Structure 1
């Protein structure tokens, strides 16, 4: 079986699994589900959700509980149970950093500050955050990560595990960097030539970066640390490896230290890409509920040099519709956090209550992509795709003729598909033209892939999709030529029925149920 690999070409990206583009329709467990006895509280949710990939931690403390004494009993059970359910895995290496801290490091690491030193603040006080300049800390992490990859090289020949996250939400809360003596000698020294050359900057940290020197130095040493662990593992088994970011608010971030300083935040991606060339991608962990902020994050993390992977998102209802713009940007995956029944909710980040209705909000949007996952993945890499979500958030208690026209206008989205445009509208009947009022709660979205100049693959959810010509036609009229509902079977299109009459007179109207359409448009002469 070919190794999984992240391909980047012509500003576009694909996660190759078993030799073809793949989309992670994921779920991540809660943080304490990384034990054989927890797995029975994970699989039922994964099945109800229709997820094709599970993200789950493997902690340094569990595989190396005493220095040099490795224990992979958890990984064995996990691999076997995942294979029985025919799902893939993303392993999350919880090690030097998990949410800025060494809590998942073994006791012999996290209780031995002199061997494995912490960030020191400017006032001499210590924070519970391991210094990225700790050379012993890097050697020890790297050694254990190598043993994990050696386990997968020997025990996972078919690559049940398709990708590994190196650390979890690196960085530091409460300070901008390490101000220890060890760190201060590096800060006061010259910025490395390799970084000065990659950013095309004149050649110390204070000298070249001014007001940003402290935050860029921490981002740099953390990125170098993560890059060395990653090379060490990839030398054993060259799987896709990525880092997940504790995001700063892209519109009003506040100061580094109030957000996790040093992580792959939107102001330091240029440092991260220069310092960590062996890390495949930098992934946003999204817990902003509001459409404008999430849209800004997807825009910031979708780059020619950065495949979009929504490595975590909140598991509350409003988050499910962000799958559509994720995929529309060419994203490789989407992974709601806390999808297990281990009696924990991360509300107010996620759902207040975890039940079947919490799962069902993601299951309903996964049901649109699962039936075409391989076809969609190839179209997003090789061609043109689009995706949108309902752009107004649910009406707040605070907020509850003119405001109705304003909302109808905001709930109307235009997409340029070449010779044709689509107009996507939310929260209206399946007949006539009464203007959009939005879904309660906000939930709708749409996917479109171009098959040919006049032919699109369309699936949507609680929305109307209407096509029209992109450019003024000259003495010509236009019509839908044919709408077919169907499915892909062994890579071939199988028609179930033709949508026509009422089903195409008022756009293409979608409810909560899955329907995959092929839409062929035509301009025709009336001369």
Structure 2
């Protein structure tokens, strides 16, 4: 297989694509944007301006299997062709049984047979436009269609590896406390599967507190029915619902894994607010609260991947990043700070703004992905190590202090939008990337004086070699008192006529207004 997840010397998972470490500098198309060849083909040049290396794009079951047994390879073939022609990798999103909780992408022949493919029932007894996760017919039909898709991908792509990942379903779950279908009601009464109990015993110390607390409130029993082991309540209902979803999707993934195993992730719609009960978000999806249930139920799913559109980004990513779960963000906001934080602080595999094709000529985001691309080899070398951190200011923060080997770094922010990453590449050497912050280096050990030795601004060329554009000194480093991560500059056409001395004094007359994006800096340090 040309794409594989492999744990590195630090215990961080890495994506190895065509034999090298690969980080998805990605974006996800709008949902309907891959539904015709012409519409998708109209987007490639937009996407290239953003410097993506990876596009997340859906294949819909309704179009892929328009009548049962009859497959249409038009869209996957054209998608793969266009990605190759435009220098992109693909992560294929499978909009099958469920997309945002519902079954709107199921085939017409699935939708119209509600006897074979039964629906979720509301508390009111009404069938909704969601196939029940308790319907094995649907599970089997979805599995067959997905495995057929993956068979084809292997046939047309095993040698090239344009396709590097798979996402079965999209943000699954019900907007209810439970499914009231007869099969759901019956499942709730059953014995808790031993695979879950055995996972909880084995992983007891590291279980989510949400699962552990319910289990323990009911005696932490190692057998019995759902309502015996977890009580009769919203959580027990969520737990057996989640078990069913993870189980159904695991079955779909396993069929694919058996013939062509690619890195496979499932994505969640987040618990939007801390008090929210299951069903205000999709009940069943791999939110962090039920991470253990998904891991226990679905070993053919590699990663549980948060879709993040909320402002509390740093806390959210820390919540999803675990020893058994690399950070992978398939839908997010088009904000470069978030990318640098995910990649540098949490060694993330993917950052992917949603609706990417509508953001062409977002210049700062584009130049941010250019800089991240230059850094992929170095980021890859330091994933999971304590020698790499992110930088990202949040409202009301003024600094970050960290210790890195012999040095203390005081990161101070110079604007609301301040972000980047820092890698200690050497005992006395750092690479700093980003914008709108400064770094002060001092000695950890107080019997010594630590100082910047030399600062170089630059980038990595198309061969991966460091090329310096300036040795930054004097005004540009306040005489090596500090690293200023001002960023790479781009003058605009607009006149600036800025010639007056501004009263540490630096005279910086300017004729044009300018635009700024992350820079890359190599700092050597010394102790005396």
Indicate the SS of the match to 2:139.
Answer: helix
Residue 302 of structure 1: aligned partner: 321
Establish whether residue 282 from structure 1 lines up as the match of residue 301 from structure 2.
Answer: no
Residue 411 of structure 2: aligned partner: 424
1:49: Cα distance to partner? 0.9
**Are 1:14 and 1:381, in contact at CA under 8 Å, matched by a contact in 2?**
no
1:514: Cα distance to partner? 4.1
Moved more, 488-497 or 270-279: 488-497
Give runs of aligned pairs for residues 203-222 of structure 1, distance below 5 A. 203=223, 204-210=225-231, 211=233, 212-222=235-245
Indicate the SS of the match to 1:199.
Answer: helix
Indicate the SS of the match to 1:268.
Answer: helix
Indicate the SS of the match to 1:235.
Answer: helix
Residue 170 of structure 2: aligned partner: 168
Give runs of aligned pairs for residues 315-334 of structure 1, distance below 5 A. 315=334, 319-328=335-344, 329-334=346-351
Instruction: Give 1:365's match in structure 2, choosing from 368, 379, 387.
Output: 368
Instruction: Give 2:520's match in structure 1, choosing from 502, 505, 516.
Output: 516
1:486: Cα distance to partner? 3.1
Give CA deviations for 1:304-326 in whole Å, capped at 9, x if unaligned: 000101111023xxx33111210
Specify every segment of 5 or more residues in structure 1 that has no aligned partner in the other structure, as ranges. Answer: 342-353, 393-406, 428-437
**Are 2:50 and 2:360, in contact at CA under 8 Å, matched by a contact in 1?**
no
State the alpha-carbon separation in 1 of the partners of residues 369 and 260 from structure 2.
30
Establish whether residue 456 from structure 1 lines up as the match of residue 430 from structure 2.
Answer: yes
Give CA deviations for 1:204-247 in whole Å, capped at 9, x if unaligned: 11111123110011111001111111111111211101001111
- CA, structure 1 residues 234+255, in 2 after alignment: closer, same or farther (shift >3 Å)? same
Give CA deviations for 1:317-341 in whole Å, capped at 9, x if unaligned: xx33111210121111100000224
**Are 2:328 and 2:350, in contact at CA under 8 Å, matched by a contact in 1?**
yes
- CA, structure 1 residues 415+46, in 2 after alignment: closer, same or farther (shift >3 Å)? farther
Residue 389 of structure 2: aligned partner: 386
State the alpha-carbon separation in 2 of the partners of residues 222 and 8 from structure 1.
27
Instruction: Give 2:352's match in structure 1, choosing from 335, 348, 372.
Output: 335
**Are 1:375 and 1:491, in contact at CA under 8 Å, matched by a contact in 2?**
no
Give runs of aligned pairs for residues 103-252 of structure 1, distance below 5 A. 103-156=104-157, 157-173=159-175, 175-200=176-201, 201-202=220-221, 203=223, 204-210=225-231, 211=233, 212-249=235-272, 252=274
1:65: Cα distance to partner? 0.4
Instruction: Give 1:264's match in structure 2, choosing from 259, 273, 286.
Output: 286
Residue 37 of structure 1: aligned partner: 38
1:145: Cα distance to partner? 0.4
Moved more, 189-198 or 126-135: 126-135
Indicate the SS of the match to 2:376.
Answer: helix
Give CA deviations for 1:14-35 in whole Å, capped at 9, x if unaligned: 1111112211111111011112
Give runs of aligned pairs for residues 42-57 of structure 1, distance below 5 A. 42-57=43-58
State the alpha-carbon separation in 2 of the partners of residues 161 and 444 from structure 1.
34
**Are 2:3 and 2:164, in contact at CA under 8 Å, matched by a contact in 1?**
yes
Indicate the SS of the match to 2:519.
Answer: coil
Residue 500 of structure 2: aligned partner: none
- CA, structure 1 residues 58+125, in 2 after alignment: closer, same or farther (shift >3 Å)? same
TM-score scaled to structure 2, two decimals? 0.85
Residue 349 of structure 1: aligned partner: none
Moved more, 5-14 or 94-103: 5-14
TM-score scaled to structure 1, two decimals? 0.85
State the alpha-carbon separation in 1 of the partners of residues 368 and 466 from structure 2.
21
- CA, structure 1 residues 422+368, in 2 after alignment: closer, same or farther (shift >3 Å)? farther
**Are 1:390 and 1:426, in contact at CA under 8 Å, matched by a contact in 2?**
yes
Instruction: Give 2:401's match in structure 1, choosing from 390, 402, 414.
Output: 414
**Are 2:66 and 2:108, in contact at CA under 8 Å, matched by a contact in 1?**
yes
**Are 1:310 and 1:334, in contact at CA under 8 Å, matched by a contact in 2?**
yes
State the alpha-carbon separation in 2 of the partners of residues 355 and 382 from structure 1.
34
**Are 2:406 and 2:445, in contact at CA under 8 Å, matched by a contact in 1?**
no
Aligned length: 470
Indicate the SS of the match to 1:152.
Answer: helix
1:95: Cα distance to partner? 0.2
1:13: Cα distance to partner? 1.7
1:94: Cα distance to partner? 0.3
1:11: Cα distance to partner? 4.1
- CA, structure 1 residues 513+121, in 2 after alignment: closer, same or farther (shift >3 Å)? closer
Give CA deviations for 1:361-410 in whole Å, capped at 9, x if unaligned: 42132132122222222222566311021211xxxxxxxxxxxxxx5xx2
State the alpha-carbon separation in 1 of the partners of residues 384 and 313 from structure 2.
23
Specify every segment of 5 or more residues in structure 2 that has no aligned partner in the other structure, as ranges. Answer: 202-219, 488-515
Give CA deviations for 1:84-125 in whole Å, capped at 9, x if unaligned: 111101110000010011111110012222111111233322
Instruction: Give 2:449's match in structure 1, choosing from 477, 487, 491.
Output: 477
State the alpha-carbon separation in 2 of the partners of residues 494 and 338 from structure 1.
34
**Are 2:41 and 2:82, in contact at CA under 8 Å, matched by a contact in 1?**
no
**Are 1:42 and 1:339, in contact at CA under 8 Å, matched by a contact in 2?**
no
1:68: Cα distance to partner? 0.5
